[PDB]
Amino acid sequence: GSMQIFVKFRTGKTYTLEVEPSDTIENVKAKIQDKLGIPPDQQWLIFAGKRLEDGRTLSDYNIQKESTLRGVRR
């Protein structure tokens, strides 16, 4: 399946991201590289005051449609 989420940076700039509940955190970073040109190794993703773990799925973190991830430049 698919859902739309958001990713927000310290600029305030908030981008849509098209994901799937089964996606791993690494896969989400890969999508961010495709959209924004930020390599995975240069990214952290934060939700609910946690840094999301690379091998966990979006479904594990209970990420819903229209949820906002916070992107951090590594």
From Swiss-Prot:
Membrane topology note: Peripheral membrane protein
The record describes its post-translational modification as: Phosphorylated ubiquitin specifically binds and activates parkin (PRKN), triggering mitophagy. Phosphorylation does not affect E1-mediated E2 charging of ubiquitin but affects discharging of E2 enzymes to form polyubiquitin chains. It also affects deubiquitination by deubiquitinase enzymes such as USP30. Mono-ADP-ribosylated at the C-terminus by PARP9, a component of the PPAR9-DTX3L complex. ADP-ribosylation requires processing by E1 and E2 enzymes and prevents ubiquitin conjugation to substrates such as histones.
Its localization reads: Cytoplasm; Nucleus; Mitochondrion outer membrane
Parts forming coiled coils: none
Residue ranges occupied by any Ubiquitin-like domain in the UniProt entry: 3-74
Summarizing the function annotation, the protein's role is: Exists either covalently attached to another protein, or free (unanchored). When covalently bound, it is conjugated to target proteins via an isopeptide bond either as a monomer (monoubiquitin), a polymer linked via different Lys residues of the ubiquitin (polyubiquitin chains) or a linear polymer linked via the initiator Met of the ubiquitin (linear polyubiquitin chains).
The name under which this protein is listed is Ubiquitin
| Organism from which the protein derives | Homo sapiens
Per the record, the gene is UBC
Q: Which residues of the full protein are shown?
A: 609 to 680 of 685
